[PDB]
């Protein structure tokens, strides 16, 4: 009888091991698997850029200045050129005249229309553009409005345009653009607002076509007076949805592929509508566009707060698919002394102008292979069963046969 005690004494211990394995399975654990994937091709990403200056000086009209002057620190709250004028001679004269509102009658005004008309024009900025040996043009850039205003996306892959592709590492197989940032067109800076900057240049974001830019937060800078090389590495991150993980596949609201940025732009929009009863002109939805006074009084502070300071309003669920681009930047000078005169003549500018306004930007991949990092289910059904039946043989000597035998017996 000592045996039947020992047999069910080994059976008890088997039950414990088995419930452990079952409890583990119902945690739905995951592990992370790293891999390097060699490729014959890569989809070239989308490339969004913005001039750091939001409004062309030569495009600001009396009416513009009337509605938006205070926003841009060109006017005080009395609609007057402030005596804190940190301006040269000619520009003050132009602005004084433009600010003469005596017997002026205000016409309708809209910030979106104002960005669209006054913002820098890709057709003037783009001195040249090449992708993989092929010449590209302003028609290859899609307009996208952002917090910086009127911006441009290369290779947006929208409106049925196919996504461009790279097939080798290195500079020849990417994008090269020459731009004129047009500093003579920069708005005089007479104060500090969210729409003005102390800086000259562009902001750039390299991103998947399935995600909108968030260029004020996640871009990188590029300076005039240099050729900048940006050597990229693609990394693909894959997460599991529930019950294994907490990644979110799609959103059934403003954007139809889910990404952190889509999430943040949704939140920001809901937050502005909720707190200001208006949206900024780059945000999606139906709500009215904030007036310049609303930008100044409510929308700029609310968005600044939400980004910088709020800790709970927006907390975005991780997306199941994330494409990320590691980047190595470096710079050389443009123009050389030997090329300044040539560039000056070619674009009808002085050499000083070329030196202050021209930049070249090269974006390309180091190598074609991309890295993948993936959450894998760590203990599926097949693994649970084969583990249970392996513990049988360890505790009892039980088997798939030994088990079928006890149905013949019973």
């Amino acid at each position: 009888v000592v045996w039947a005690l020992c047999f069910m004494g080994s059976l008890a211990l088997l039950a414990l091991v088995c419930t452990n394995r079952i409890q583990y399975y119902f945690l739905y654990p995951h592990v992370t698997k790293l891999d390097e994937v060699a490729a014959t091709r890569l989809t070239f990403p989308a490339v969004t850029f913005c001039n750091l200056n939001e409004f062309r000086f030569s495009r600001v009209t009396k009416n513009d200045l009337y509605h938006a002057g205070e926003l841009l620190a060109l006017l005080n709250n009395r609609y007057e050129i402030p005596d804190t004028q940190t301006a040269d001679e000619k520009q003050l004269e132009i602005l004084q005249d433009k600010a003469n509102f005596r017997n002026f009658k205000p016409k309708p005004f809209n910030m979106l229309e104002f960005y669209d008309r006054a913002g820098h024009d890709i057709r003037e900025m783009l001195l040249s553009c090449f992708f993989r040996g092929e010449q590209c043009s302003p028609e290859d850039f899609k307009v996208v409005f952002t917090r910086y205003g009127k911006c441009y996306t290369f290779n947006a892959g929208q409106d049925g345009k196919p996504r461009l592709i790279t097939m080798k590492g290195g500079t020849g197989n990417g994008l090269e653009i020459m731009l004129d940032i047009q500093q003579d067109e920069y708005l005089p800076v007479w104060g500090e607002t969210d729409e003005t900057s102390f800086e000259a240049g562009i902001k750039v974001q390299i991103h998947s076509q399935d995600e909108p830019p968030l260029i004020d937060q996640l871009g990188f800078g590029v300076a005039p007076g240099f050729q900048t090389f940006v050597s990229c590495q693609e990394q693909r991150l894959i997460y599991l949805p529930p019950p294994w993980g907490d990644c979110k596949a799609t959103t059934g609201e403003f954007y139809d592929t889910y990404s952190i940025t889509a999430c943040r732009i949704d939140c920001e929009t809901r937050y502005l509508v909720e707190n200001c009863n208006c949206r900024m002109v780059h945000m999606p939805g139906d709500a009215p566009y904030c007036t310049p006074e609303q930008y100044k009084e409510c929308a700029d502070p609310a968005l600044d707060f939400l980004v910088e300071k709020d800790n709970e309003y927006c907390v975005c669920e991780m997306p199941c698919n994330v494409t990320r681009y590691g980047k190595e930047l470096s710079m050389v000078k443009i123009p050389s002394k030997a090329s300044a005169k040539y560039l000056a003549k070619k674009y009808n500018k002085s050499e000083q102008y070329i030196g202050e306004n021209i930049l070249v930007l090269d974006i390309f991949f180091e190598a074609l292979n991309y890295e993948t990092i993936e959450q894998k289910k760590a203990y599926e059904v097949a693994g649970l069963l084969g583990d249970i039946g392996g513990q049988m043989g360890l505790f009892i000597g039980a088997s798939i046969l030994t088990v079928l035998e006890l149905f013949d017996y019973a």
Partner: protein, 60 residues
């Protein structure tokens, strides 16, 4: 005191102690309840199986 004090606690975002499931927590910045994925780390009680429940108990 209009809503319980646990309503103001952060839910355990991204923390896994088991299976992830749809849940709802009170967001003290929106002042309303919001969907999230709960992974069984019972760190506090700011998590509900349904939106209405969360809105009933914590909305006020």
């Amino acid at each position: 005191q209009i809503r319980p004090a646990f309503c103001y606690e952060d839910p355990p975002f991204f923390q896994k102690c088991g299976a992830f499931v749809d849940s709802y927590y009170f967001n003290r910045s929106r002042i309303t309840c919001v969907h999230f994925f709960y992974g069984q780390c019972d760190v506090n009680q700011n998590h509900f199986t349904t939106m209405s429940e969360c809105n009933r108990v914590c909305h006020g």
